Amino acid sequence: GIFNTRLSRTFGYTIKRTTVKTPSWAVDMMRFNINDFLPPGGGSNPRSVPFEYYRIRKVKVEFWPCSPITQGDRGVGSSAVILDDNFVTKATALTYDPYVNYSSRHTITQPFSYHSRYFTPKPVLDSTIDYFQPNNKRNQLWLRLQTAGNVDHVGLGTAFENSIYDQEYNIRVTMYVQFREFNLKDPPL
Amino acid sequence: GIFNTRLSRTFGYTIKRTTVKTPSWAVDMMRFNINDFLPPGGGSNPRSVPFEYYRIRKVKVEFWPCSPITQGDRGVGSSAVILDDNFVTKATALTYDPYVNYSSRHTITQPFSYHSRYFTPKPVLDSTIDYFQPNNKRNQLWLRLQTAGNVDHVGLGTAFENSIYDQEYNIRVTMYVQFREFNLKDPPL
Amino acid sequence: GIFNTRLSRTFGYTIKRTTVKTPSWAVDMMRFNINDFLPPGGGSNPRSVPFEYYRIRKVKVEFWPCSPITQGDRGVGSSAVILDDNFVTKATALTYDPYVNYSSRHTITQPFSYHSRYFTPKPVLDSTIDYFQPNNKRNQLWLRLQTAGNVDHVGLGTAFENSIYDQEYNIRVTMYVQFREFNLKDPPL
Amino acid sequence: GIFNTRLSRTFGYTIKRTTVKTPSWAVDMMRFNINDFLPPGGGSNPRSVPFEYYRIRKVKVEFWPCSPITQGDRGVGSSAVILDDNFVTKATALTYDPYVNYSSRHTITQPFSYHSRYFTPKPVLDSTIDYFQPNNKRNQLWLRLQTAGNVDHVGLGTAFENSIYDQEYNIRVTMYVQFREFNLKDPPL
Amino acid sequence: GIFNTRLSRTFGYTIKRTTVKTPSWAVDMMRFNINDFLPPGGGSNPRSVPFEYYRIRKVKVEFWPCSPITQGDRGVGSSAVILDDNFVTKATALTYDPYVNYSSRHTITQPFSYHSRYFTPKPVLDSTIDYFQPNNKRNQLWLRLQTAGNVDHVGLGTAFENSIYDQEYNIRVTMYVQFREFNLKDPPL
Amino acid sequence: GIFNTRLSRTFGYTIKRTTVKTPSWAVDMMRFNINDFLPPGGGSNPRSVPFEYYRIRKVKVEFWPCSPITQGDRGVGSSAVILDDNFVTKATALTYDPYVNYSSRHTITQPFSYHSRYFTPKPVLDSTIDYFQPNNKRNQLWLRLQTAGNVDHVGLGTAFENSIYDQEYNIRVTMYVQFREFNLKDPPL
């Protein structure tokens, strides 16, 4: 019983100002979990979408700027796809862009420019070995939609060039999911 | 955002015994409401299936017998489709089968025989005028999935021939519904 | 169990003379209810025609004159289709013809001439809102044949030029209906 | 104004037990009249189906058993079509099956088996001469739908083999009729 | 007598400022009535457009900004189509965008960006049941153009992200209507 | 914004009796103005049809008789088309029919006979020079729909033969007009 749908979530991210003169970059990570998109249900149905299995097909991360088009001290960054839960260490002012030479690098124009990334994440099945599957719609694993313990999906790391002014963003993540085995429970009343 | 699914519900019905010698029939009615198939949800989602609109496409009423194949004093009844909320009055021992000459009559062999009816019900929009639409999948009205006040659908009346022995049935109603406008709400936690 | 047929009825209508010199017109509406055409039945069958449902297809109004051809003080009037049960106000002698400019106007010669109209009426579901359907034979609704509470249909209003003489007509109505769901009941005797 | 419809009626028939050891048969007759299917009407319409003429096209006699499938002392009988109102004399325990060598004989398995007969009856126009028409849909006579004096149609005789146990049946006769000349009368009220 | 035309109306909407730091959204509703587009007439014609019936085909809601392109603290919202008169409750600072996961969601870039929505509304025939028709130009109901009591059409709800600065808009609603039955009345003078 | 419609108006005309023995004719004129067909509007809309420009395409003058078919002293007259506002002088009993030799003469049978004239009128732009355009639908001038000062259109003159009895007529003029530039004004309320 397949049901392809779309789930979204919005949150903020700010790159604080720095008095540093050099071009330094701010590094951070981004994971994706389905608990943040799918709330708990009620009653005999533990989740709000009554299905048993799921598998995330795609994610769309949108960096919607919060800064005016008149803001100066512009910069240039990079967003890369990291499917293994080993990101570059979080840094405030690093002397280089680590994600620049990555094959999945897209340039981030800053601060007042929109940046989208559309990709297929991978689940963290074993963080010790960090193995994942290649892209195959027919062979992608089905995970279970747990009650409160779903596994973290992974796949984006960023590097933003710091500035004299604060750079704020409203990040909207949209997960395109595919469920299976409609499992609604209908007790009496 | 269409989602065709199937919702079921099971309950009992008994035709008590009678010392009456004549062939008399027991008349009863059967309505269908979605509150009995779809429970209330939890939180910002008032229902367990997160959709706004619905329209019932078909219903399958199954009379599953509870009586052995050795039971005697067998009989013959009738099930008809009544799409207007004006049934023959409920009777214990009526001297005739009212639903026999109906164009939608199917014979009910009793007591140990299975009887199915598959039809398209109609909602009770105005019980004073009792108007309904003909069968058209493209023009069928969309109703709202209310929180605790959904409208009764209608469409089956029965007439069972009484017997010296009690005739029990387990009735399984299956509604084939079609929802629209996925409306999940995801507050923070 | 479809059954197309024809029903009719006859009654009188008169236009009393007026000493007024100006061209004045007399206004009156016309409703249509089935209880006037279909008497009650007898016994278990509340109506003489054993069906549950109906839906009117067409109506044919016939203004049969009662007057001679030699009558003078001839005039001219109009009739129009009105599907809301909010007609022009009834009037004796109005200084203009309200129904003249309506798109559904058919001229009326007076006093000794035949006049006919052939159209689709509509019912009165909600007199507050006064809504209905366009002409469609497939999507027309099915009403219930009540015992003593059928709904009034609508669809004609008139305007007759007054005169010095009394103008009397014999009005014949004819309905073309379509029943369904043969519902005869055969108790013993 | 033709209207083909279907009228039904249900009643009982029992073959009482006998201590006789031999194979004996119980003979009985079956006539069909429209008064038993069509009740009287009400008011100016003397009958409940407002038509003038009729002619019976077919009849379906169904012997629905009342006995369990575990009942022993089974037997074998015969049902024949007798279109002339001269049946074999009614007998309780006759030493042979009279209807066995009839060209219209169908075997009746007893007691827990269903038996149907579908045929075209004939009216009793003159019981002295006992003449009837062959089967012709285009040339079949139209009779009048009288008020309380309709003519008996004829066409089935049976022979049931007696048993130590009582053999009960619920007999459902269905007449497929064809009316003509819709004659509804609509007085005022 | 069909006449397709276009009626417009302009009004303001402001999202007041908030000292709240989090991303919160301001929720509001939008209904459409023809009294706000069609004024009352004069004399025997109760309305300024001399027709009897109407049905709204489409509506174009245009959010024309009032804010400069240099305004900061930008945001992202959502507009959805709600055809049933049960909107999300009006809120000043809600912790999430309720209309984000709706199938009819369009993103609203704020504050200095234009947003249009072009859709087919539905009338509020019964607010208790909240039923409406699917899109069909041939089967769309004709309503009556009342004098001062027309029914509210429905179909848009919004969610705007709050800001430190006031966000003003000039909203221009354009209804594309279709009238019927030209009913001009021409008394003497 | 073109809108072709039809506007009507009804009024009386009587040819009084004369004791004169000779055949004499009664001459009269007939002009057409849009103020007599289109009333004043209300509010910011000065007219009831909300358009700016107009041009009259055709006019249908219908002489509906008021006299019985038994009336004697019958006669013969003439109706001609006069597109220049210089009619034959109005006369009570003229010794000849002036409009008889006109190329646009149609015979008027009197008194109980219907007479129609269907033609294209012309406006009175300059009564001193009396110039008009030939018939061309594509090149016909657009006039302005003034508030209370529209220009008179012209085009019919008549000659009725007098009689011992009074000859009354109900004259129905129908103008087929074509408007342009829908100019509805919708202030607030």
Ligand SMILES: O=C(O)[C@@H]1O[C@@H](O[C@H]2[C@H](O)[C@@H](NS(=O)(=O)O)[C@@H](O)O[C@@H]2COS(=O)(=O)O)[C@H](OS(=O)(=O)O)[C@@H](O)[C@@H]1O[C@H]1O[C@H](COS(=O)(=O)O)[C@@H](O[C@@H]2O[C@@H](C(=O)O)[C@@H](O[C@H]3O[C@H](COS(=O)(=O)O)[C@@H](O)[C@H](O)[C@H]3NS(=O)(=O)O)[C@H](O)[C@H]2OS(=O)(=O)O)[C@H](O)[C@H]1NS(=O)(=O)O
């Ligand atoms: O059915 C009854 O409850 C009952 O009916 C009558 O008694 C007979 C039985 O019905 C009859 N059975 S059968 O079903 O016909 O087979 C039979 O057994 O004989 C009995 C006795 O008859 S006898 O006495 O004549 O011998 C009787 O009514 S009457 O015959 O009309 O007088 C009453 O006893 C009773 O009817 C009354 O109640 C119903 C149900 O409402 S409730 O009672 O409040 O629960 C009333 O229904 C009202 O109107 C409808 C409607 O017109 O659609 C609804 O109105 C809402 O929807 C419209 C829009 O409609 S639509 O266009 O979408 O289709 C809105 O525009 C309205 O604003 C809505 N109403 S509001 O917002 O609440 O105001 C709604 O169900 C209800 O609304 S309300 O009550 O008007 O508010 C019914 O009208 C009333 N009878 S009446 O006499 O007042 O007409």
